[PDB]
Curated annotation (Swiss-Prot), chain A:
Effect on the protein of changing residue 300 to D: Confers resistance to abacavir, lamivudine and zidovudine
Effect of residue 122 to M: Confers resistance to delavirdine, efavirenz and nevirapine
Annotated effect of mutating residue 285 to F: Confers resistance to delavirdine and nevirapine
Name of the protein: p51 RT
Consequence of substituting residue 177 to T: Confers resistance to efavirenz, HBY 097 and nevirapine
Included range, full protein: 593 to 1015 of 1435
Effect of residue 177 to C: Confers resistance to efavirenz and nevirapine
Native species: Human immunodeficiency virus type 1 group M subtype B (isolate HXB2) (HIV-1)
Outcome recorded upon mutating residue 166 to D: Confers resistance to efavirenz, tivirapine and trovirdine
Positions occupied by motif Tryptophan repeat motif: 365-381
Recorded consequence of changing residue 63 to N: Confers multi-NRTI resistance
Site feature: Essential for RT p66/p51 heterodimerization: 368, 381
Positions annotated to bind Mg(2+) 1: 97, 172-173
């Protein structure tokens, strides 16, 4: 028995155009799909079906085998509708790919048409191969839901037999957190792996990083100026930040290189601001009824800074990401990684993907991101122009 | 020749209903014809007579038949897009031979969804009852007829394909391109086999004695199964030239620019300036003459290439033609081009060569993926150091697939570089600008540590043009090494980005100025604060 599902009132199925793919990735799919066809998970469709959703293939480099990924973002948005602060604190959380479970469940006939997608051909030599789902599609919002029941059961055992652990599900991913030192955590997981079969993350380390002010032995007109600007901007967050004494040391038309001693008051004003900046600003609270936002700036040399916030100047969390182990000189690589990492934390903390604001040109992102993606889900995003200001700050 | 292929189930847009239009008169002649014609299809099985229950109808015509479903189509569900994607020659892979079986009758021979047929009812015209039938097959000019015909085609081909892997087929409207690596007779044979297989489903197709012959002409080319040639292009020789003529000429010439090196249209395009009507005539300037003649020569030389060899790598090389213009050629073996093209300067806001090259490279990568499913190894007229220098410092994420430097000037370089720290022993200009946004009157000036100073009033300017202006003056009245401090973020941004081309004159001026200088350091400070020399110019450019 399959539960009936409907599109929000008035809405119609996606008719998103398919992106062109690499040979490498095209083959992967015909393979993956002829298999799914045999097993009857999906089936070829007729021209009378006008809907479409983009598909492509990635590999969580947790394998060398290819995995099929469908971009239901559009569909999910057009689909009717129907979280623990725990892990948010846990010592360690591990993520599990349960996409599979869905393929065990059949999809309401009347709704299948909407899940249509297309395997393209090169140079257009041929028409693409069109299929539509017969089971619950991975990445579809409706799936985790409908599979809820079956899911809860399956878990319950490991649940109240390990209550000293938290288990959260987000789409095709299961987040499991415990305080058990690495030894028991890793084993308890494998213990859970087999349990499901029979059918590294660290939350607290994520704080709003501190704004640091530079310390010089000698200050030039330039130096002071640069410091006053940063401070000034910073006053938006901390209204207590004063810049008067410093603005004094600068009055007159001096040369930028000219060195300037700091008046004892300038000294104070400065020391006082350093203090204020020793803690995130007060009164910042996650508002469930508002969109989460993630913004990222390219600091260069491999670094990237970012902020999750809902309202301007009231950051919920901020961070930096640098390139570890693996000669990576490829921005796009880095940015996709960066975006995943971040979407991940959001999910953990609040269990919601953030709306991204990317420092890259549409064309560039579109042409290559897919090449580095390694997640069952896909957040929302828009492209922008980094104001040099916001950059020197988080730098 | 009706097909015994399962029909595609059709339906009308959500909650709509069949066409109910009425036709009153036509001549004795126009009625005689239609009666005959119908009776023909009638028997062929194409159509049938309907009666009791069909409340639907449509205007029938006679043209020296024609049925207009304009209304039916509006009420017909949407189908799956036929796909505008077209194979491009450079994508094709060499074959020994390739014929084109022409279906034609194609659609008219495909069963129409039974259920839907009712809606396809039409009447013939002054007694009592006239003549009424309904379609039984995919009707000429109907909405789903294309879509439905191709799907059917594909099904019918699917087995044959699976049994003849070696054999490639391309379905294009009413034509079948079948090529292969078999010998001359084995091929001719398979085509025949293919034909009876098609004719085995009511899909009549021409015999070996009637099919069209190679090379086939395709979206611009003349192509055989082992090579292709740009079907040569001629330019009309004429006494008088109308605007319209000129325009088409430019289009042809423009298209040629892709394949043909050296084509130009500057003086030819000039002729359009001021034109009052398409039918107007323009005295071809002598300069236009020289150019027109010149192109005729370039068009004379034949150009031909070859297809893609999966067993070889692609190589794309780019040249910097003018400012923002780029030429590129793709090949698997030197001088043996697979495809070439050109990209016009995308005149935009404020950019620079490295960024632009980056885009060209991006455009090509995309195109290449579409055609070959792979991205070429690139040869770029840019120094590795240049690229490193630029990217590691550009605020935006940028990238270039694996490539290598090819020293084929002119090369793309950075026209100037801002200093990382203030210049020791260089004048310091504290520039500022601002304009009343209600009147658009503004002031822009500066002051320096070296006592110097200047200011200027401006009309109809805007805030941003003012601040830019301010920096221009500073750049002007400054000499080889400068330190400029502005309170404008707009400017900081623009310039911080090291632009070498813009559509704003002032910005161009500044750029020019920037290239001129020996060392320039631009710095920014918050506007309207007690801060430095800023509060000095702040006061002088007021309102
Ligand atoms: C127009 C067209 C589109 C796609 N492929 C082809 C063609 N036509 C050809 O003449 C052709 C030429 C060379 C190689 N493949 C070709 N064929 C392939 C089918 C044998």
């Amino acid at each position: 028995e399959t539960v009936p599902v409907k599109l929000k009132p008035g809405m119609d199925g996606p008719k998103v155009k398919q992106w062109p793919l690499t040979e490498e990735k095209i083959k992967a799919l015909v393979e993956i799909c002829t298999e799914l066809e045999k097993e009857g998970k999906i089936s070829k469709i007729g021209p009378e079906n006008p809907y479409n959703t983009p598909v492509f293939a990635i590999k969580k480099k947790n394998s060398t085998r290819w995995r099929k990924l469908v971009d239901f973002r559009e569909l999910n948005k057009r689909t009717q509708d129907f979280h623990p602060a725990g892990l948010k604190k846990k010592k360690s959380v591990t993520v599990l790919d349960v996409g599979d479970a869905y393929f065990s469940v059949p999809l309401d006939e009347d709704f299948r048409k909407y899940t249509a997608f297309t395997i393209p051909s090169i140079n257009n030599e041929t028409p693409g191969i069109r299929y539509q789902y017969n089971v619950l599609p991975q990445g579809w919002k409706g799936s985790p839901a409908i599979f809820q029941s079956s899911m809860t059961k399956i878990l319950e055992p490991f649940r109240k037999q390990n209550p000293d652990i938290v288990i959260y599900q987000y789409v095709d991913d299961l987040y499991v957190g415990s305080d058990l030192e690495i030894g028991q955590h890793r084993t308890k997981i494998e213990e859970l792996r087999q349990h499901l079969l029979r059918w590294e993350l660290h939350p607290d380390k994520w704080t709003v990083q501190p704004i640091v002010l530079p310390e010089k032995d000698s200050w030039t007109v330039n130096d002071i100026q640069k410091l006053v600007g940063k401070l000034n901007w910073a006053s938006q967050i901390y209204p207590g930040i004063k810049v008067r004494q410093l603005c004094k040391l600068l009055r007159g038309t001096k040369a930028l290189t000219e060195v300037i001693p700091l008046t004892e008051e300038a000294e104070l004003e400065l020391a006082e601001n350093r203090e204020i900046l020793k803690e995130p600003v007060h009164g910042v609270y996650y508002d469930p009824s508002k969109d989460l936002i993630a913004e990222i700036q390219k600091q260069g040399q491999g670094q990237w800074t970012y902020q999750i916030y809902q309202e301007p100047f009231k950051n919920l969390k901020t961070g930096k990401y640098a390139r570890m182990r693996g000669a990576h000189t490829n921005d796009v690589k880095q940015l996709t990684e960066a975006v995943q990492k971040i979407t991940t934390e959001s999910i953990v903390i609040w269990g919601k993907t953030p709306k991204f604001k990317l420092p890259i040109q549409k064309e560039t992102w579109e042409t290559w991101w897919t090449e580095y993606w390694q997640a069952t889900w896909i957040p929302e995003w828009e492209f922008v122009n980094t104001p040099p200001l916001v950059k020197l700050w988080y730098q | 020749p009706i097909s015994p292929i399962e029909t595609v189930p059709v339906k009308l847009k959500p909650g709509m209903d069949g066409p109910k239009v009425k036709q009153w008169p036509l001549t004795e002649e126009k009625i005689k014809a239609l009666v005959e014609i119908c009776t023909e299809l009638e028997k062929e099985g194409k159509i049938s007579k309907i009666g009791p229950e069909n409340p639907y109808n449509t205007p029938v015509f006679a043209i020296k038949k024609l049925v207009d479903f304009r209304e039916l189509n509006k009420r017909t569900q949407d189908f799956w897009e036929v796909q505008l994607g077209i194979p491009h020659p450079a994508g094709l892979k060499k074959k020994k031979s390739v014929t084109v079986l022409d279906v034609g009758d194609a659609y008219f021979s495909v069963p129409l969804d039974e259920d839907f047929r009712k809606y396809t009812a039409f009447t013939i015209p002054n007694e009592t009852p006239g003549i009424r039938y309904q379609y039984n097959v995919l009707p000429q000019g109907w909405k789903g007829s294309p879509a439905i015909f191709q799907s059917s085609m594909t099904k019918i081909l699917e087995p044959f394909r699976k049994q003849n892997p070696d054999i490639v087929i391309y379905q294009y409207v009413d034509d079948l391109y079948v090529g292969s690596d078999l010998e001359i007779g084995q091929h001719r044979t398979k085509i025949e086999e293919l034909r009876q297989h098609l004719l085995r489903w009511g899909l009549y197709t021409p015999d070996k004695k009637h099919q069209k012959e190679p090379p086939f002409l395709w979206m611009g080319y003349e192509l055989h199964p082992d090579k292709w040639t740009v079907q040569p292009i001629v330019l009309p020789e004429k006494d008088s030239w109308t605007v319209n003529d000129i325009q088409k000429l430019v289009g042809k010439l423009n298209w040629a620019s892709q394949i043909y090196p050296g084509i130009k249209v500057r003086q030819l395009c000039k002729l359009l300036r001021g034109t009052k009507a398409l039918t107007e005539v323009i005295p071809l300037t002598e300069e236009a003459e020289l150019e027109l003649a010149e192109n005729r020569e370039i068009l004379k030389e034949p150009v031909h290439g070859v297809y893609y060899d999966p067993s070889k790598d692609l190589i794309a090389e780019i040249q910097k033609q003018g400012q923002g213009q780029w030429t590129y050629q793709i090949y698997q073996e030197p001088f043996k081009n697979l495809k070439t093209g050109k990209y016009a300067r995308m005149r935009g806001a404020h950019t620079n060569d490295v960024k632009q090259l980056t885009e060209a490279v991006q455009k090509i990568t995309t195109e290449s993926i579409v055609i070959w499913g792979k991205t070429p190894k690139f040869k770029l007229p840019i120094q590795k150091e240049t690229w490193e220098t630029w990217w590691t410092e550009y605020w935006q994420a940028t990238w270039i697939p694996e490539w290598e430097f090819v020293n084929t000037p002119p090369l793309v370089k950075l026209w100037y570089q801002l200093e990382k720290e203030p210049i020791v022993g260089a004048e310091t200009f504290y520039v500022d600008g601002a304009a009343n946004r209600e009147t658009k009157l503004g002031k822009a000036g500066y002051v320096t540590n070296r006592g110097r100073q200047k200011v200027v009033t401006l009309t109809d300017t805007t805030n941003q043009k003012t601040e830019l202006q301010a920096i221009y003056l500073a750049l002007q009245d400054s000499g080889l090494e400068v330190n400029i401090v502005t309170d404008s973020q707009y400017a900081l941004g623009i310039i911080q980005a090291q632009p070498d081309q813009s559509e704003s004159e002032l910005v161009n001026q500044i750029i020019e100025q920037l290239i001129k200088k020996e060392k320039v350091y631009l710095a920014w400070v918050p506007a309207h604060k007690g801060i430095g020399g800023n509060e000095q110019v702040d006061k002088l450019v007021s309102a």
